Amino acid sequence: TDVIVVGNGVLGLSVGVEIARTRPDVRVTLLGKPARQYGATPAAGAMLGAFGEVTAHALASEHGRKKHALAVQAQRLWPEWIESLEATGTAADGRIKTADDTVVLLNTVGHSALDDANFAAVLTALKEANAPHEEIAVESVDWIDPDPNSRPLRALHIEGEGSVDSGILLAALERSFLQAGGRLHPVDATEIRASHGRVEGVVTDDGDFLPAGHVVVAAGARSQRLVAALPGLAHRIPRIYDGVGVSALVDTWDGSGPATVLRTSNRAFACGLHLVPRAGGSVYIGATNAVCLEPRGAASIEETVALFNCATHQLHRGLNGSELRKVQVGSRPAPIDGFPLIGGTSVEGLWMLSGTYRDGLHMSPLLARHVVSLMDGGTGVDGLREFRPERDLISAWSREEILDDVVRHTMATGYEFPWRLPLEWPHMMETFLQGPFAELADRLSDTYTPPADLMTAIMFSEREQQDELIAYYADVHREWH
Amino acid sequence: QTDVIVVGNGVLGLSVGVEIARTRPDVRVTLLGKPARQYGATPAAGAMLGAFGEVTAHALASEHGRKKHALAVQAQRLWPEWIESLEATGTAADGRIKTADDTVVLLNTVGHSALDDANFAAVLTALKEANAPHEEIAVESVDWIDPDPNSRPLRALHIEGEGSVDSGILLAALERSFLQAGGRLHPVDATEIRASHGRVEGVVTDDGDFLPAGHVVVAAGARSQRLVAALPGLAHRIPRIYDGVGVSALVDTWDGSGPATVLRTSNRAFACGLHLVPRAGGSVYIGATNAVCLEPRGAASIEETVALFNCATHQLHRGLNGSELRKVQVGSRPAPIDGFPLIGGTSVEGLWMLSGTYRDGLHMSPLLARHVVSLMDGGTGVDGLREFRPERDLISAWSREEILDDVVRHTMATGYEFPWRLPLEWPHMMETFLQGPFAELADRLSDTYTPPADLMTAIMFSEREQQDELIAYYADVHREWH
Amino acid sequence: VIVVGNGVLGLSVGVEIARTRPDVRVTLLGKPARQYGATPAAGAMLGAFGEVTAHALASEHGRKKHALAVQAQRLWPEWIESLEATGTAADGRIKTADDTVVLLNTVGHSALDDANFAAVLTALKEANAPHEEIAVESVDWIDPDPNSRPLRALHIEGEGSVDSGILLAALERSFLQAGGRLHPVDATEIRASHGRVEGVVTDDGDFLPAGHVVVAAGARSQRLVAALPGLAHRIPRIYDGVGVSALVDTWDGSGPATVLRTSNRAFACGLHLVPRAGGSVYIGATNAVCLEPRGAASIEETVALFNCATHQLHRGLNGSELRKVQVGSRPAPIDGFPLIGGTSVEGLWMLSGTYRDGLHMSPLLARHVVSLMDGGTGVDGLREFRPERDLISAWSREEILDDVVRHTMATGYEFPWRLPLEWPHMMETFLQGPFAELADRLSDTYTPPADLMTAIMFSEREQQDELIAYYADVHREWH
Amino acid sequence: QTDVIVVGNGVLGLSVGVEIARTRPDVRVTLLGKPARQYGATPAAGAMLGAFGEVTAHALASEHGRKKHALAVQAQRLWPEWIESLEATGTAADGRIKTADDTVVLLNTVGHSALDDANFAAVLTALKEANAPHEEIAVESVDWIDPDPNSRPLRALHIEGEGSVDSGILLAALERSFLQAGGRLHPVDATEIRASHGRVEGVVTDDGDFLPAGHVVVAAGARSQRLVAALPGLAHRIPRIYDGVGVSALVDTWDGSGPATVLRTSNRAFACGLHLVPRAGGSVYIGATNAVCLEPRGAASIEETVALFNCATHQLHRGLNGSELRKVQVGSRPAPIDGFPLIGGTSVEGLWMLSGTYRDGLHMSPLLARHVVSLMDGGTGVDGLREFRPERDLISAWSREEILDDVVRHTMATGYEFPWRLPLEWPHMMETFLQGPFAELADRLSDTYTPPADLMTAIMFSEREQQDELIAYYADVHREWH
Numbered sequence A: 001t002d003v004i005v006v007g008n009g010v011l012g013l014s015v016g017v018e019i020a021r022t023r024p025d026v027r028v029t030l031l032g033k034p035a036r037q038y039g040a041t042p043a044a045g046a047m048l049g050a051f052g053e054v055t056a057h058a059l060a061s062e063h064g065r066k067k068h069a070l071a072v073q074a075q076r077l078w079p080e081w082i083e084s085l086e087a088t089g090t091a092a093d094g095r096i097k098t099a100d101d102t103v104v105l106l107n108t109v110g111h112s113a114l115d116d117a118n119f120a121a122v123l124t125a126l127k128e129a130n131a132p133h134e135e136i137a138v139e140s141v142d143w144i145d146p147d148p149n150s151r152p153l154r155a156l157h158i159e160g161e162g163s164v165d166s167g168i169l170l171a172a173l174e175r176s177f178l179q180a181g182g183r184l185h186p187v188d189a190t191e192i193r194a195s196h197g198r199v200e201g202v203v204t205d206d207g208d209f210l211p212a213g214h215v216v217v218a219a220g221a222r223s224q225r226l227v228a229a230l231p232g233l234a235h236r237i238p239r240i241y242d243g244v245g246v247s248a249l250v251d252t253w254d255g256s257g258p259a260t261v262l263r264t265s266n267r268a269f270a271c272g273l274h275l276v277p278r279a280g281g282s283v284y285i286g287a288t289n290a291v292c293l294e295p296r297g298a299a300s301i302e303e304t305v306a307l308f309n310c311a312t313h314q315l316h317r318g319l320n321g322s323e324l325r326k327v328q329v330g331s332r333p334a335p336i337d338g339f340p341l342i343g344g345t346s347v348e349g350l351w352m353l354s355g356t357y358r359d360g361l362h363m364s365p366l367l368a369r370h371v372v373s374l375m376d377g378g379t380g381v382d383g384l385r386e387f388r389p390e391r392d393l394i395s396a397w398s399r400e401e402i403l404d405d406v407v408r409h410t411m412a413t414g415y416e417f418p419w420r421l422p423l424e425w426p427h428m429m430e431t432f433l434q435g436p437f438a439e440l441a442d443r444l445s446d447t448y449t450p451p452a453d454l455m456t457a458i459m460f461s462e463r464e465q466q467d468e469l470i471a472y473y474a475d476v477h478r479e480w481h
Numbered sequence B, D: 001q002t003d004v005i006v007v008g009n010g011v012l013g014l015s016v017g018v019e020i021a022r023t024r025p026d027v028r029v030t031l032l033g034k035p036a037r038q039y040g041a042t043p044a045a046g047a048m049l050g051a052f053g054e055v056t057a058h059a060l061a062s063e064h065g066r067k068k069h070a071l072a073v074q075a076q077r078l079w080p081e082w083i084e085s086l087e088a089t090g091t092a093a094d095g096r097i098k099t100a101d102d103t104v105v106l107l108n109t110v111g112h113s114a115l116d117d118a119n120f121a122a123v124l125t126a127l128k129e130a131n132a133p134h135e136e137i138a139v140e141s142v143d144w145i146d147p148d149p150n151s152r153p154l155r156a157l158h159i160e161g162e163g164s165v166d167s168g169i170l171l172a173a174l175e176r177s178f179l180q181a182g183g184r185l186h187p188v189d190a191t192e193i194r195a196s197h198g199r200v201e202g203v204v205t206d207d208g209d210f211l212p213a214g215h216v217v218v219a220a221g222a223r224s225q226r227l228v229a230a231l232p233g234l235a236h237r238i239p240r241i242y243d244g245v246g247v248s249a250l251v252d253t254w255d256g257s258g259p260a261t262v263l264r265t266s267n268r269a270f271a272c273g274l275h276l277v278p279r280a281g282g283s284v285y286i287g288a289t290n291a292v293c294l295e296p297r298g299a300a301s302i303e304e305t306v307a308l309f310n311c312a313t314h315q316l317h318r319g320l321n322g323s324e325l326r327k328v329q330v331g332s333r334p335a336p337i338d339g340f341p342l343i344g345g346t347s348v349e350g351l352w353m354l355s356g357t358y359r360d361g362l363h364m365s366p367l368l369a370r371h372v373v374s375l376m377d378g379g380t381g382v383d384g385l386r387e388f389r390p391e392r393d394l395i396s397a398w399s400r401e402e403i404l405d406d407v408v409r410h411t412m413a414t415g416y417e418f419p420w421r422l423p424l425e426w427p428h429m430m431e432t433f434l435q436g437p438f439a440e441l442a443d444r445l446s447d448t449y450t451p452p453a454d455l456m457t458a459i460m461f462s463e464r465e466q467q468d469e470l471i472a473y474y475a476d477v478h479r480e481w482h
Numbered sequence C: 001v002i003v004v005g006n007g008v009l010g011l012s013v014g015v016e017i018a019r020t021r022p023d024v025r026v027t028l029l030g031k032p033a034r035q036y037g038a039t040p041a042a043g044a045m046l047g048a049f050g051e052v053t054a055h056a057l058a059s060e061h062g063r064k065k066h067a068l069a070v071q072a073q074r075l076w077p078e079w080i081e082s083l084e085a086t087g088t089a090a091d092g093r094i095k096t097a098d099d100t101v102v103l104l105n106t107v108g109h110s111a112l113d114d115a116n117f118a119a120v121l122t123a124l125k126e127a128n129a130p131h132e133e134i135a136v137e138s139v140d141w142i143d144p145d146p147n148s149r150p151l152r153a154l155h156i157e158g159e160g161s162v163d164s165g166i167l168l169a170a171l172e173r174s175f176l177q178a179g180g181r182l183h184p185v186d187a188t189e190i191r192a193s194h195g196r197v198e199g200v201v202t203d204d205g206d207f208l209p210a211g212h213v214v215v216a217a218g219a220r221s222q223r224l225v226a227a228l229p230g231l232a233h234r235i236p237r238i239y240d241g242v243g244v245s246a247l248v249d250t251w252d253g254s255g256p257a258t259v260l261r262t263s264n265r266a267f268a269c270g271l272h273l274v275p276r277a278g279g280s281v282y283i284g285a286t287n288a289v290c291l292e293p294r295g296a297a298s299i300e301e302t303v304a305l306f307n308c309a310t311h312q313l314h315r316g317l318n319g320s321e322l323r324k325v326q327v328g329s330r331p332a333p334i335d336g337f338p339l340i341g342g343t344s345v346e347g348l349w350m351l352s353g354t355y356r357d358g359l360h361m362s363p364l365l366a367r368h369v370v371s372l373m374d375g376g377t378g379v380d381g382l383r384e385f386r387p388e389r390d391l392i393s394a395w396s397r398e399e400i401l402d403d404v405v406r407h408t409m410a411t412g413y414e415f416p417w418r419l420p421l422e423w424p425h426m427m428e429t430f431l432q433g434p435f436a437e438l439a440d441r442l443s444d445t446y447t448p449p450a451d452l453m454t455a456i457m458f459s460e461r462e463q464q465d466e467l468i469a470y471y472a473d474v475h476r477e478w479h
């Protein structure tokens, strides 16, 4: 029985590996090119972020608390998953794990309404989960050499929350996939073919047709656009946008690196500052985030400067004199309703693994096992049912909660710069931002409100793009009510 | 009576008092006001004899603004003989009224291009049109200045015969000249003007006394309209005047030096600006902030003092940083609600007004004095003052659209003048989000009247009750004149 | 008895003498103008734990000064009761706050602010003082710029503030009630012969006889006594620690319920707000050691004071009305420690060189000197601070050179500056050599503390050479 | 042999290769170098045809600097025919070498007055002295630019006929023209020049081969002196060349637009500068940082990338902020230790050098190529270039005092160009404390030689062992020539 996995990121390869190992009866073919155009995974550090990803806003919603529980469950799978992938290689392939622990730093280069609230939410989430952690003296954090005006005054050590080399992970997944009898076919899917409510297979961009009983779409930010061509699915699969992220590999001045992940809490519009250790005198610094209504594969000047400025001031001034090896750009799959698209469709044999935004790589072994269990007639992981791909848009927050959040995040872009303004200006800007965002939210839809990250993108998009989204929301409402 | 009472002891009241006393030796002229000069604009002034230095693109884009500028140019011609006539009543030991003959206008980048670049070009054009002597000079040739390099000027304009006076020595010379001409000083305040059968009878003072008069000249600064508005019908016939609260400072320089000229920028956000006026005895005057306040204020805010000092130390001379602060001065520019002065006669026989002169009453004083004295003698005074008669419908010198463009530009200029450091997308975001609220305010205040930018920002950030009282005021004025 | 000086120390000792010796005539000199007066420019904080620095507590002399500050705090409640007792409700309240909050923000050098916050916490724990580290969100009233906000806060119970003006009025009233005489003239000269005080010549030409003269003339105290034979090189010099503060009427008439402060910052300046009655707050306070007196604020001092308060404490102060810029001279002793007690001249006493905390220590210092004048031994730990002494060397030259470079760099971080990231390390490297060369040139044995060392570094060559001569003459006298 | 080997495939090697191949059709010319162009200056260049734009007050204060400037002016005259002759060997699809005809020099306050104001005046003086066509223009008339108002220019200078080329299209045109003239491209590096009996024999390549030749022209950029220094005595007879590491970037503009002219500042701290060179197809070039490194570096630092982008987005066009980064480019300007190029013949028969051209070798290339080809043919080439012969005692173009003033000014300029915000006493404090250490370094390095400011800062912040090796180098040069 033929299975085609569309996409060669962490999610496609993780599901490919689990099918190939688990299902000796199926021939599994994985599509995607070595260039990995718009690929999130190669641009990732990556942090195995569960507690580090906690925000007050996320944990204020039932859907956010459910997503967090799944991130905590995923962390338990990583040690055996890494062992099983390194087992198919040798010493020369390098180590997947680059750090065991994370330090979260609190500095004043940001908004109190995000950074202070989020630091308290991380502490509360760790205490509630009984996770091992300690608030530590900043003086005890090794390696860091911040600008004194940008320095942390509080620090939180999270034990067993670490990082992987995303490049070594991708290489280990491909090697493990081939060892288990998987086939890599380096072309893109152009079209999923279906008739009589069942997948027939995939047309490739070299003109070929590949037959299959099962198609798993794990094409990152392209996943919904690929499935939306099939009858009715345009308004039944929530849209996925590009959360364009910029990161960099730097060769440090002295070849040193920190022993732990160093990070802030999530910041304005789900960007954040972090350093992930790498082998061989390299560090990863990340990572910007901007929701784009169309794909973008190149860094902007603004993104590169903000990333470098935050890292050199808030983490280590020695990075200033360090050599830039690579500016990396990738698209976090940004779901329009703020939650992932994991599981089966109304089309027999059609599955989706996408819309994982900031933490698909961390959740990958859990999500892979879930979808593979479903494909085998199992029930997979409890609590992933709410994130089924064919659904009405989730409304995880009130319009009022989102309007408060989008104004706070807008103001946070100033405080994170950090700006220097006359003291009356911030209050003036807060007062004049409220009305326009309230008017936009009211005009977009009577029922759906986009989360803050997408709402700012819509606010500053062309009138034609806003009108097309008004029509999309109206057609979704029609379909599900 | 043929007795004259001048209400007010600032530059305007004393200047008119001197001109009346010298021109009518047959009549008794009495001047009211106390030596404290509460909220007094004149003692807080440097002061610059600003004509060309006061030019803005926005002012010269209106007919009323061009008329106000023509009068400033005419006033400048009177200053040399006026000063000679005042110093003539004193001796060398009284000190010199004039502290500088010339002005240098500096162009730096610590401000909005839409104000500073437009205003510098407007000053150059106005000087050329008036055939005034001036030269664009090398910045390196400007005497004394030692700016922060990131705050330095890259262009400089020397204006010949546009100078400064010591406002304290001017006030002393005016009082001395007033007494020498037979004027009487009565150091009390007027509480009420008495009139009946369309004619002034005189003035009740705050010690309970009644002083009779055939002529009353109101030059009481920002209190002038409140004083006249008590008389029948005049409450909606005399445009309101608000307090343009200005902060300045006297500094003893580190080495006792000072520049040989006035140093200034063009007028900046909401009619503030940066200037240094030389003084004798190792002192310099630095000014000056401006904020229209709906009620009087007699104390500097922290924000005003810091902005004044920061601009002077960075843009003029870093040596001022180490210099000793002698005095923070606060005074009220009389800020007329329609943006133009109140000069001349009333529907009440013998009642005259000299007020609402905002930034340049001191500069215009010899011209305004001669104008009102000519009118009191049955003359027509100075040509082009007619539009600025005190009993009038509110002037609309600009379109609502021109004022809305100006108030947004001035708001943005408060950022660039700080100077702020922001992400590059933020200024355009703030411009876009400022437009709607200012347009909504303008539309709500009145169908016919629009306050100038300086007052519009004060109204925007005032209490709902103060906005509603202004809506009622505008409606009552409309009723009275239409 | 003649007390020379009408600040907190002179009036406090005057009150204690007049109350304790009703048999003796006590006359207090000084003018209502209080030229260069430290006391009227003070908030004032009853600073014991708030004044703790890592540098101070690293020396034996610094630990002794701190112990005395802790002892002084215990005397304040009864002292205030005894002074308010001589007045009525209409005189106003001396005490303006009971408690202090210390804020830690990043608008400063880690090497000062982080070290000093840890030192304050340690000193509170060691003294068993009641205190709590609190959530910043729980600090009432404050509205900082988010980029200037505190991330840690420390509530110190029973460390409060007084209105310095109401204290001065209460001391004068209490002095008169106890039979003291106020003579509003200055002393020009102390007269002594056969190793004994005869009295004081005043600036109106008069001679006032006395068996006892107590010099509490603030920053003028040593210059006054140095005229007497040999005392020029036996009484440590006192300089002017010129301080700028301000009274502000708040936008809404509100004020905080506690003192709000940082730890001491570059060259012993600091940021604090002291509550006052009637919709006023006190903000302070700058500090610059000047080799000559200065009675006017500089532009730079006024801007630094206002900028720190509006950003780090409350943005609402920006729109608040300036009522008064105050300037006073902290008596800055050349060896960093006060001059308290008796001299080799019989009947000649000194109370001076108290720098940042003479007002706080006043009831303890007053009782000490009055005990000594009565043949007692006063307070146990004050002996090292006797006014007739060789200059104290409380720190190694190396410790002071590290401190002066750290404090110089802290003037940048406290601004706060924005510079290319290589510049701070470049400036640290190029500051070390010149300060080491200055220290080596001034003397083989004495090193001025950082606050005075920066003043000497940027003074005229003639002023440096006069100090080299002074240090050499002191060495001669004592070795 | 009569065979010629050109060692190096940058603008200078290819330009000389083309001129030899075209002028000596009888001889085999082989050009060495790899398509990677490791550390290559030319591919990282915009490039500006900078003659007047490169003028500084410091350069024109020395006789050697005035001679270098005269040669840059002469080179400009050759470019039109040179470009025609190179495009002639291609077709329409190869694209155009010339990307702009004119340059605008902008003066803003994001820099030190002691560099930017002095250099702007020096450019104006040099244009007037040369009778070159130019105009000081209104900043409002400069097309395309959209600066941050706090970073905006207040003066602008239009230089007619001073333009730019696409360095990539130039390199492709030079290779094609070299082949068309009968040149051979051998894509390997030289490891060693072989000579005996005072004559070149040829070149050993890094693939182990030996290539015989009668003539070897070394145009290996910053590697040129290290290659020749192996030959007897030449270690102390050919001035050292260091790496002037430069960072630039190609950006796809938000709307596909670009300016019609080069936009630039005068040269800034340690011979960095801000400029935008137009490119075809919706791309712009922005440059360019400069740091002398004692060892080669092939990667941009974080600091360099941020400074380049921040200056361009604030001072030229805020729209670049939202523009897509296509490429960060890094190349090594050949930085001669005595500040002047190494052009011409050696004491070794058939050995020639074209190197040490720092910021303007690409601009001078057609003149330098014709000069060396004339010398190889027994001519005297171009009149003023004999002073820049490669085998020489180190030039001392400035007094030690002039260089100590310059290095302190340039150090302070790194602050003002950031731009920093500091307490007003700090800059004077840092100036005072920088003077002593730079004077001590200069005194310790040598009794006779002083490195120019750009190299002096690199030496100041290098390891003690690197300083000691330079002291030995200077002593060995002194020994050799005195």
Ligand SMILES: Cc1cc2nc3c(=O)[nH]c(=O)nc-3n(C[C@H](O)[C@H](O)[C@H](O)COP(=O)(O)OP(=O)(O)OC[C@H]3O[C@@H](n4cnc5c(N)ncnc54)[C@H](O)[C@@H]3O)c2cc1C
Pocket (backbone or CB within 6 Å): A006, A007, A008, A009, A010, A011, A012, A031, A032, A033, A035, A036, A037, A038, A039, A040, A041, A042, A043, A044, A045, A046, A047, A048, A049, A187, A188, A189, A190, A218, A219, A220, A221, A222, A226, A243, A244, A245, A246, A247, A286, A287, A288, A329, A330, A331, A332, A333, A353, A354, A355, A356, A357, A358, A359, A360, A361, A362, A363
């Ligand atoms: C800057 C950055 C930092 C990050 N940091 C972290 C981190 O710290 N921790 C963490 O857990 N995660 C991190 N992530 C990643 C995040 O978890 C993502 O949600 C996750 O990588 C998504 O994986 P994916 O396989 O769904 O998508 P991708 O990784 O985008 O993979 C999809 C692949 O499919 C290919 N494709 C597209 N269309 C087709 C088609 N038609 N046919 C075939 N192939 C196609 C694409 O080229 C691509 O290679 C980061 C991402 C970014 C951009």
Ligand SMILES: Cc1cc2nc3c(=O)[nH]c(=O)nc-3n(C[C@H](O)[C@H](O)[C@H](O)COP(=O)(O)OP(=O)(O)OC[C@H]3O[C@@H](n4cnc5c(N)ncnc54)[C@H](O)[C@@H]3O)c2cc1C
Pocket (backbone or CB within 6 Å): C004, C005, C006, C007, C008, C009, C010, C029, C030, C031, C033, C034, C035, C036, C037, C038, C039, C040, C041, C042, C043, C044, C045, C046, C047, C185, C186, C187, C188, C216, C217, C218, C219, C220, C224, C242, C243, C244, C245, C284, C285, C286, C327, C328, C329, C330, C331, C351, C352, C353, C354, C355, C356, C357, C358, C359, C360, C361
């Ligand atoms: C800005 C500032 C803030 C402060 N804040 C605090 C604080 O928070 N807490 C605290 O505890 N303390 C504070 N202090 C004060 C500090 O404690 C001082 O050490 C203390 O006030 C010194 O008091 P004194 O009486 O010795 O001097 P002063 O208060 O200066 O009194 C000396 C008096 O003697 C007079 N005098 C001088 N020469 C003669 C003469 N020849 N004859 C007669 N009279 C003469 C002077 O005019 C003056 O009035 C502050 C001081 C300043 C300047």
